[PDB]
Symmetry: D2
Subunit: 359 residues, 4 copies
């Protein structure tokens, strides 16, 4: 066209690039994080099984109404990740549920991946499907009100099986980069999620080594495909020891080795990191996010994209009952504020421990 | 047991063995592939010339015409089908796959879901199709398909640095994922990185680009653990640009094509099935002949031709079943012409 | 617990810790690096412009002039030396290194062995030096050197598709090998991929290329297991080309430079020490100021200047022993000017 | 100028490309292979210890004279890899060593690498030094008469330590590619040697897996550095089990898995493969090379670059003594012809193959 250095990806249009940037900043606003309410019909069934409830469209609509219709939730929540159904759903009173987010001033988002499949020639390592027709879905989702997207990839740590294998790392890293660039082209901020699972008895150090390698590879793919980091977000695992590791580390280690590995791999042009919580308890999700943020004023916003970590108690203190909606939202604000405080490094929770004297 | 773990794993013996034999069969001496995999949209554009409504009965009678030719299997090893055609029956209620089985041809299936633009390129193309591909392959193997096709498209525009790196590895990586999913589900993948001939570039520039693309493609295949022995390559021949950078000869097509392949294709790959592109029926045969005149090669150098085998077969049919005999004449004629070009023994009509 | 093995191993606690502290010291608040690492080849040029003979006594007196300036350590954290100078003594018979030890300035050493052409490129450059580098590093550390320099050179020539991939990866890989050998032998490596300003390209094109090069450089660094915390980057500022046409404002230089670093440099890298290139002493300071006016950065954005710190020091010296004190005044002036630039608090006030 | 595709290595000058091609073909001539005589003063010191004699410049010159002055060795040997000293050396009678080769019509070659060093951040995995001043050494070596070069890199298989690590693979792969590209520009055919050591108890299949991965990486490096495969040769390890492995494997398996892994990774533009022999006995080096070539005609010449496998017994039956030069030269031609026959898949030295085992009745009608 205007013969410049032509072996590099082209720039997004001024207009689209600027909109993506603003949404991304808003998503990691001071003291705010993301609510992952994007559970599928099969996933959201299992949550309703705990509380003895049928997985009906009315029950799903009432629960998302419960969540999104909470007053002053937007104080602590910047965006909400939805499953497709919910983006086009209404509550029993007929109100579009996206407008409940609008009214709390919360940005709607949409899970766009089509799930996991095995990579052949690996030992059941996972590839994330979704690229077919994605551009066209994104246009539709933006019209529906969605301003950002989610795509989840899964890597596993199994040292003796060389596992997260090179194939696994680049399938993941490349698919995330394709996804991200299709989103941005069609005006959605991509949340890039390379979840390294915490399964196994590996040390926190091994996790740091792997998480650092994976992330270097992810960002390299991101640059290859021309992804604008300014209009994008990262949803990584925290750096923890594996689930069955006998050496039980502490929240300060989680905080240090997590911050370290991000500092080595994440360029500051990326406006923020929205941590996934994995199988962490609601409380640990907050304690560990706090320990991360006690460790600095960071070059990017270090915040949360929590589902289970924000919803677990809300479901138990609801039981499908329209009576308990008030007390269910009481708890959601509680958890939302708890993690909003962790964002600052000011969530206490509930050494300097001393019995004192006198003079 | 103490496996070198950072390496793609092997296929199970049984499936690896079946892929290998299918791939060898597909490039049998004196035989090539018939590309019959036109979509409803592309096949309508052919029927647009002969002036028949692109109906399901018209499409079935045309594929019946092609696949029901006696002695076609002497020159054709396999036939690439469209999904419809794979499950379709002719006007006498007979499955097409059975017409190929009778005539001893292996059925194949186009599995890609078409092209889309790569963002942040100048309209360079990404091939869609990976979503649900494994499940479709299982279904196609059950339907009788033993091999697959997936077309990717690259473009030579020197001044714009076309094949940009992004285009080359999006293509190369997509072909490698496709190929490995095919093989796991017992289909021989035809890996097609068509470098289009559009533009005014010289044959040497095409050689440089084709060589670069191919090195990249094969690197991706090894990455993904693709068994070359159970796979085929469908590359462009190395020609100058359509805008004729001083019009080169067929001797030059043959040399620069064979060179580029010798530099980039390991001999474990049992064969290369060339795509015709925008070549006339005769040019497709003359050039394939010039390639094979350059002597016994380390792999089978043969054809996967659609337009180059069907163009005249459409004309001597006109939809009117009075020309089913006459149409099948021109099919066998062209199939034998390219079978002879396989051997390097095809003058064409004097020279 | 049993290591994930497909990854480069850690530095010993002790060596990693020492590299980290040296690297932080080198980018101390309000401080930068003095590039005094001129080879005989190049310093013979500067002596010939001030009409002096290039003798060992003249070289020793000039480095004595520079390093013996009292109060230089206020603005200078480290000094990059040429091999000779590291083992050299003054006319008085006192180690040149001791003059830095006295001003509390850290000595460093250029360790590359110059440039050669990469074959199959159009005269694109490979930096030599890896042979025996480990053993030289041990020797240099014993001589007092705590950090190293290795210069690679890329060129922007859009038409010829310059920094070709070959050039980018040769450069990126050689820097990574160098950087890792240094760190193993207890020297902080300054990683210098200078993209030359030659040509008529826009500042945006430079940004595009500088971004691509840097992504590639840092990828190589992780490959080789380089500790970013114990390393420094010496990149070009993002400017338009020398023979461009636009008037090229200092604010645009600051913005596109900061942008490209934010996209490509992880914050574990404690600082960036900019090369001046062909800029004048003042333009080196104005542009460094414009970079730091763009507000507290995640790393220290400072300087590694030779020409930009020495030009007027040399011309207001002319070789004469009387003019030492007068030349040393001119040195401190420039050192403070860039020290202020570091804070974003230097002279330039056109608004 | 006229714009071609710029993001691609530029070709060799026609004249240089043409010369490298013919040298490479000659080096893998039918029934011929390469004699590795590139032992350093350090390496050769260990050889003379076993034959009791001292390591002097006169001893080294007499031994290389012994080897290169053998009449009719060029029937079986296409080229000889020399150490620098030897390239500029003369015998007692003032005859240059490389002239001994010209008369026997053997092409002289030169080891150009400067040895191995550890890659930091690996567990003692090896980087090959030599690129500094290599271009200038090549010009000198070509003037001295050398037409091809050798550069040895070393990888190790240690599955429990993931060991040939990505880093080891790419340092090796990239250093071989830079070496090769510089050699070709200065008119020397590079022998690219990524020796994967046989140390350990890994199976032959694991070796195949690793050798294939390494080779794919090496060739990727060559193409990106713009190396002309037509003017280059590969000196890989054969695919064998590990040294400690059980007490098992067979020569036909070495042959199959070796041929397989080369077919999957080596483009036919590469005119030939000159196998290194590692720790194999002189006979094993020949038996295995024979098993490789019994597997039908190949798309490239599969031959030998043998040092110890050609010199071990020659050295035993010389003893440093002027008297025995004829006796030793006897054994050199013997081994040289043995491997020349192995090139054809037509060597049989004591065994032959697998059938029944004699004791056959003959009932004529």
């Amino acid at each position: 066209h205007c013969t410049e250095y032509m072996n590099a990806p082209k720039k997004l249009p001024a207009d689209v690039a600027e909109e993506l940037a603003t949404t991304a900043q808003k998503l990691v606003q001071a003291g705010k994080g993301i609510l992952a309410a994007d559970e599928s019909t099969q996933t959201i069934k299992k949550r309703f099984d705990n509380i003895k409830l049928e997985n009906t469209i009315e029950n799903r609509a009432s629960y998302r109404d419960l969540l999104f219709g909470t007053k002053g939730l937007g104080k602590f929540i910047s965006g909400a990740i939805l499953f497709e159904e919910t983006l086009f759903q209404k509550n029993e009173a007929g109100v579009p549920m996206v407008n409940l987010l609008h009214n709390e001033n919360i940005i709607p988002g949409i899970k766009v991946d089509k799930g996991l499949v095995n990579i052949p020639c690996t030992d059941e390592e996972k590839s994330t499907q979704g690229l077919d027709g994605l551009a066209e879905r994104c246009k539709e989702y933006y019209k529906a009100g969605a301003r950002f997207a989610k795509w989840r990839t899964v890597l596993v740590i199994d040292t003796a099986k060389g596992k997260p294998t090179d194939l696994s790392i680049h399938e993941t890293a490349w698919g995330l980069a394709r996804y991200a660039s299709i989103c941005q082209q069609n005006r959605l901020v991509p949340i890039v999620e390379p979840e390294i699972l915490a399964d196994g008895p590996h040390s926190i150090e091994v996790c740091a080594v792997v998480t650092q390698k994976v992330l270097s590879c992810v960002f390299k793919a991101l640059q290859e495909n021309g992804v604008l980091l300014e209009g994008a977000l990262l949803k990584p695992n925290m750096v923890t020891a594996g689930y069955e590791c006998t050496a039980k580390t502490t929240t300060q280690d989680v905080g240090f080795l997590t911050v370290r590995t991000l500092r080595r791999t994440v360029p500051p042009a990326l406006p923020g990191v929205v941590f996934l919580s994995g199988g962490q308890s609601e409380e640990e999700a907050s304690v560990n996010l706090n320990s991360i943020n006690a460790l600095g004023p960071h070059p990017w916003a270090l915040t949360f994209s929590y589902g289970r970590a924000l919803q677990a108690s809300v479901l138990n203190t609801w039981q499908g009952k329209k009576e308990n909606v008030a007390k269910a939202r009481e708890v959601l604000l509680q958890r939302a504020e708890a993690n909003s405080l962790a964002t600052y490094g000011k969530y206490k929770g509930g050494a300097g421990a001393s019995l004192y004297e006198k003079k």
